[PDB]
Give the backbone structure.
Amino acid sequence: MKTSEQRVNIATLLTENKKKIVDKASQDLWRRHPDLIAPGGIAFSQRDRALCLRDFGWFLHLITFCLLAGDKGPIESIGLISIREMYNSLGVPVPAMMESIRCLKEASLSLLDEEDANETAPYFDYIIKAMSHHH
Amino acid sequence: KTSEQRVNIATLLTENKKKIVDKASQDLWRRHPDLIAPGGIAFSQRDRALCLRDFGWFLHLITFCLLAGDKGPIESIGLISIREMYNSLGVPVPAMMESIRCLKEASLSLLDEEDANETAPYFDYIIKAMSHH
Amino acid sequence: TSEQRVNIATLLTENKKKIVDKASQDLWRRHPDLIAPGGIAFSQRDRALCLRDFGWFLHLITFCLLAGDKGPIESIGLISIREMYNSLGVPVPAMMESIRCLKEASLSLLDEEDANETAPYFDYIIKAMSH
Amino acid sequence: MKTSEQRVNIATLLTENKKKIVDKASQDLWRRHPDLIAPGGIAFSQRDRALCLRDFGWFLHLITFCLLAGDKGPIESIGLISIREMYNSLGVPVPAMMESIRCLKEASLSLLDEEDANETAPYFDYIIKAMSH
Ligand SMILES: [Cl-]
Ligand SMILES: [Cl-]
Ligand SMILES: [Cl-]
Ligand SMILES: [Cl-]
Ligand SMILES: [Cl-]
Ligand SMILES: [Cl-]
């Protein structure tokens, strides 16, 4: 394997448990802020909206792609700027995006062993910092 | 041999299950976000909020009643057992009633006027069953 | 029968996804051409089975379980369901096989006493979907 | 991509119709090779397996990420090589991966307007070439 085996394994494990991770994460946010995450009937492209499960899955895939790519900042990639821009135009609140990704972190890291969690936590942090304040 | 109208209405509701359940759940959620949670929740969990699975359960139930011609006033054995199931789940009565009201509006909006008039009683039957004592 | 039945129905309902995945995959391994991936318009005439058909039938068997309806008399609902699928042009052999797969998947999760209680309700629906 | 807004909109549109695209794509493959795509979920980590819906959604997100990033080769990104490697170890055939991505292409492009399809097609081609060694 050219690419890191650790990374490939972490990515396959996150991919395999996508549903479990997204349920745990969304439910965790919902318990605390029920008004920020709707159960269905929101179009991803709808301006000025609450979170939906699709945002949770988007971000999970994104963090996995970064993990595989070794991209964890400090330089924000072109892709990551375009994502921020996409969400910018969607009008999805910054505090809520940050909180969704924090919930995915806790959900994802709980499934990993300690060495893998330590390796993976920075990639969540990268994406949380990226999706923050205004720009 | 059995009502073609009813079979057609049931097919149409079954086909648009996702669309109906999204609309219905979102409708309830906009008004009472704390009563309907995202994603999968253990259906058997006592003292819980609603999940999408409850919306789909009830839709299938109303469809089965429609197919069976069962719209009260006498409550079937099945329907009493369903109420009982939910009774033990500790799911609030007002919230169950409201979930089924939202499915009604969502389902009837897809039907033409004659079919809506035919189908509305089956929702009312279930809404009344799930409001007990 | 009442509390046992309610509990079995709750348990089947709770494990709907797990049951439907197991059942569909079981059919698919043996007859891949009879069950397609993802969502298909339910009303589309002359189609393959989809996961939604598996979930429909599971809910149906659960309703029968709750109602105590296991034949020999076929309920009007059950005849109308057969009719619905009849017009959809889903093959009879494939429907029967889908329900057999749900049986095996559902019964494997139950303890032996509950499996014995529940098996007849699957058999009822399989016989019903066969004319 | 004419404007950066066009790209953002195409990415939003692909994301929004993920389910519709993945159903169409998987069904398209399935009609031709039913033994290569199983229904409703397989353990993603299982060695020597058939395709599942999760593979279709993975690749769609990947093509969207490339679209947003402006990455359409010819040079393969590190991430893209790692993805190929991931699948390599999963024992999923090269011909089947290529075919899945071709199906997503046709499914995704059919939902776009013709101008947007012309813009988007290169990103699919990039990923198809990448998944071929
Ligand atoms: Cl908080
Ligand atoms: Cl709200
Ligand atoms: Cl009236
Ligand atoms: Cl048709
Ligand atoms: Cl996916
Ligand atoms: Cl145009």
Notes: The pocket of chloride ion (ligand 4) is lined by residues C 44-45 (CB under 6 Å). The helical segments of chain D are 4-16, 18-32, 53-69, 78-90, 94-111, 114-130. Residues 39 and 52 of chain D are 7 Å apart (CA to CA). DSSP finds six helices and no strands in chain D.
